[PDB]
Amino acid sequence: MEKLVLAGPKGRAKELLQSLQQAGVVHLETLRPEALSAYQLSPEERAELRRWEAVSAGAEHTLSLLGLEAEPARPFPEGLEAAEKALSPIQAHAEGLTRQKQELEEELALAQAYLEPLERLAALAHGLDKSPFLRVIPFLLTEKELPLVEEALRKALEDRYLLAHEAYAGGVPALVVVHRKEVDQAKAALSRAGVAELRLPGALGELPLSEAARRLKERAEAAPRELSEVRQHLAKLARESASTLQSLWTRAQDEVARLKALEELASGRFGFALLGYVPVKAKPKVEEANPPWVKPFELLVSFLNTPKYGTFDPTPVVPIFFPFWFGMIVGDIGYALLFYLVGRWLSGYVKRNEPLVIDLFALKLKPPVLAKLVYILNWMVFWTVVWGLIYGEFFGTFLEHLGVFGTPEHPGLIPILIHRIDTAKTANLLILLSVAFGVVMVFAGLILRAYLGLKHRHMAHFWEGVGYLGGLLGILALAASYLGNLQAGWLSALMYLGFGVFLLSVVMSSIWLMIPEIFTQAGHILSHIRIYAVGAAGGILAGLLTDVGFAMAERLGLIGVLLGIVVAGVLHLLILLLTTLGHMLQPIRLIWVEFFTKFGFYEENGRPYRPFKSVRETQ
């Protein structure tokens, strides 16, 4: 049989063992870390690992040069010998092509800059730059500097110096021509003004001007043609063999990871460890073992199966999000109506963007792999837009009517004149309807919170978690005495007094050394109420901006207003989007009050495992 080595954590010893036991692997026996010692890699093993890293790196190097890097999930099993022989010709060829290319590009950059001055300068003293009798010194002057330089030279060098200049479109390249042995004096004069000698890089700088000028003119013409070719040969090599490198990269990487695995396990850096045996047949088999609701749930099953604390499933989160999330969309005239269209561009395809190619083949701004992952997300968006179109007629219950309100289904001048969601009675009930769901979520998090300390068997969490839920009851009690006054809520004016005893009476049994801090527990209650209220009311506000964007905001309303309002409407669209996206972050802002405060959830101030925001990114 094949020997196989296993690791896991101490906490899941039994759950890991049961799963492995089932999977294919048989003869599972535990091993403590002292047993794992002395099975650290021999020097030969470390040399294979070093070499596997070179191949990994070496591909990253070749593949980056050649063009773009792409990491596939497709390796190609090969030897040490096979992978290194593959890599050596292409890296060599490509290294060589990129070097030419850099030299070609630097030469162009200098030649493009300095051809016109050197031409001018060479011309001025033509055939007198290679004479010993006369000395030439080139230098650049701006219009501003030219008088100063001339004065300085003239006093220094009398009237037996020659200052000539010729233009080039902007300043003047100037040449001063002086006798041999009058060089020091000539220089000294330039140095006092702050002007210094122009010399180019390499052989050209050192060559007579006439040679330097002829050659620069030649390099500017030649380079762009040769650059084109080198870039072409390099493109072909990527095109044909970018895959070869990518497949070496993946394979090489798998071997590096395997040998690293054995060095870690060997130093007794995994707490629960197993040894077992699999026949050759069993070896694959071990590795082997309404859409809105079902679809995200089947991917979440992978997190059902790995618990980490006294926590329960992270799955209650998704159906709390959905009603509240759909009800941020409530327009029906140029808000939800426009947004319908948006859905199709993410769940179909567009080419009206540049960084985004065709979505149907998985090509977006986001990385090509990430884009294939967020298909599910894009669907979950599509389901949100769809349901929002329905809750846009729910809103139009409170608008449209031919007798209850003073605005028809569609007036014949312009659709929508004045909104009729400005009735006082109508706004309050839609806010109070919304509040009721926030309350349901307060009970559900703290009831699980208690069950958490019961099955994690820390009484200090149980006791604190039970007590805080008493305060909700007081909070609601007190509200009723003010929402109904004494006409209603005189059925909770006496229970409230005792509701207050419950908040503190269980919490004190754990003692606790910050009694004030209970104020902040009451803060969390309050938020679920305010956020659901903001979710309705701020949602409704979204619609009331659309008054002046695709509704009467010109004349008294008339036929012309229909096609006149669209001036302001388009300008209004980007403004509208930004504030309504702000509301859609409320579901997650709500979730995190409870989730990261260990209300039947994994998190509690830090600790591995993602925020649900990132989970839902892909699901």
């Binding site: 010893a13 026996e29 535990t30 091993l31 403590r32 002292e34 047993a35 629960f272 040894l275």
Partner: protein, 48 residues
């Protein structure tokens, strides 16, 4: 957890290694005794 696994291979591995030392020693001793005795006869014969 199970100390049984790692104990019972260690003390079977220790025996395998001791048994390697055994037949290495019980051989080198012999080879020298044989060579000692061959040449003894080659002294016994040479003088005779």
């Amino acid at each position: 957890g199970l100390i049984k696994s790692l104990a019972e291979k260690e003390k079977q591995l220790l025996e395998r290694l001791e048994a390697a030392k055994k037949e290495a020693e019980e051989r080198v001793k012999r080879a020298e005794a044989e060579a000692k005795a061959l040449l003894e006869e080659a002294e016994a014969k040479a003088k005779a």
